[PDB]
Amino acid sequence: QLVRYGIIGCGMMGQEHLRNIALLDGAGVSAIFEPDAAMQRAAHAIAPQAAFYPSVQALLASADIDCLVIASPNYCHADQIVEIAATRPLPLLVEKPLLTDPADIARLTQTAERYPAPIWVAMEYRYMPPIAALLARAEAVTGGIKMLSLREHRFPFLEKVGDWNRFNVNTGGTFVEKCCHFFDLMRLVLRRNPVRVMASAAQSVNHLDERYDGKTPDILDNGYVIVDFEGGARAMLELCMFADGARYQETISAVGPAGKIEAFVPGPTRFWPGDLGAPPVPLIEISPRLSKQIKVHEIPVDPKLLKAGDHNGATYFQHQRFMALVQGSSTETEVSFSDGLWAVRMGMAAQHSAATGQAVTLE
């Protein structure tokens, strides 16, 4: 049967959902709630058959949908999960971060415990082809992952609808908003929960000259995070939002006693100027310990997927797995509520550590 989606919030990333759903056989967007006119026009040009609703209540009351995507601003997510839970529980793909406000953790945990349908948190990085390749090969190459290092070097946060992503109260803070992906990757690779975070971070460069109602953006733009895991593995994140010139936006290194594996992940092709030549191809580098003979493999993305989004086709691959769960051919929520909450708790811990200059314990 066809899978019919409803979308709550349809700006840049909700438009990337619309384009990638459109590439799936047997899926369609039937319903959209998007309160911004310009975005309503942009969504209506992408998905002309989709009906618009004036509210979440109106969409849930009348739409014929099998599942929902939340792509509203970060601070909206927890209230919209609670509203859907009280109104019409459906399989839900909630954009990261799962939530922004620590005060919401108890009530959302209780909501998720009682929610009779899947909750999938849309941390799609594991499906970027170079990252997926590293995940599939890391155990065999490393002989067990002792250390995992992740580096994000990119350009400053884009301008958003109502400028929402310029303030911590709206985003959850930069380690929550941008780095939840990397924290979740640490748990996926190491297959253990974190026990401690140590961080250093600041707002060194970005948005310091910007004013909104007389207020200065307060979001971090760089830092380092060390994460200790139950039983002894360790990981490190490096973030810089003013490193626009880096050839690869993400690099991920996994090391163990038999070898090392590294992924090189390009940024969005739309931000690679044509005057710079062809964008970088994604790579994986395998460096076995005993031979010292390195292997480099190109892991290109299907051009149709590069056309549909900014995340190396990962949004499409995420939807294929989500649709399989909605259809019932799969039982698996690959990125659960609990994975989303761990990744948020790790970013909150990093922000608290960076603010206090002290280690932060997690339980």
Place this chain on the structure above:
Amino acid sequence: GSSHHHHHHSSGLVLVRYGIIGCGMMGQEHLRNIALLDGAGVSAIFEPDAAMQRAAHAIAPQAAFYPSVQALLASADIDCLVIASPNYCHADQIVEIAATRPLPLLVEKPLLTDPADIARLTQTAERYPAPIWVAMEYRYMPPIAALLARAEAVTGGIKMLSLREHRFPFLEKVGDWNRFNVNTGGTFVEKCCHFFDLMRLVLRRNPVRVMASAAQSVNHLDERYDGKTPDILDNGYVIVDFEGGARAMLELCMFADGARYQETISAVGPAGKIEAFVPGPTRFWPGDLGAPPVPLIEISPRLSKQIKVHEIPVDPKLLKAGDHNGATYFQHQRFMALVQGSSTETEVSFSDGLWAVRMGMAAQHSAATGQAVTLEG
């Protein structure tokens, strides 16, 4: 001044003739590099191990051997001294030299191992009438030198400095001395003093805080020395905060033998990024794999996005003389000029050596306790 006692805390609340003392692997590197200097020679060696005395004699056949520090100082015709003894020996030997025959000294890293020696060694250095140069040579490796010269201009000001060392396990040493923290000072002191010093040099500021995670995860766990298992760390991460707000990160892995580049160093600021790619010793590159990796620097300007890569090759003659990309030779050129009086600058001071050791001790304490460690100076 710093105050830390009970509940009181100021921070952290919410011809030139050379004598050689020690002539194993690194003292033999000093012999080969001194021999490349015009108007320098090794006149005197104290090396207590017969097999190393034979190896040292084959390299520097005109050098005279002495049975102790006291014997060398009593009768050797020398203008300066190199200390390349095991780490735990350095403090006692500096004190001995200061009491007997102070001369210009090139003291191998780490400057010391035991925090109980800091006060007495600082007293010795304050009263010492000749230069003390701590032999942290990495700044002279051609790719690192290029990064140090260009980083301010490329970055528009260094906000972040990331250093990574991926290499093979600690080599076997005379009497197995480098297998035990009491002998080495711990791995962040023995191996990573170089990187902590490069952070102070690049950022031109002192550290205020260290956060670290480290362990002995893999290496030497199956070795036994008359019942003792080695206790040295083999991997970790260190975050260092600086006066003025710059931050740095060190990543160490002593079981990443396969990494093409043994050291990589990245500096990032609002105008761009610079990265150095530093090969390990050519003698450990398998000849079946072809030519060893060429040192490189990569310039990534923020607004242009026009990336440039430069090859920075080391003179073959210097690669034949040592394991450190010719840096031992460059160090010796500068030290020799200071001994001759053509220069007055000690580029790597006692204080620089002590800072790098204190940063490694803080990292080890932070990793052992799971807590941030404050530093004052």
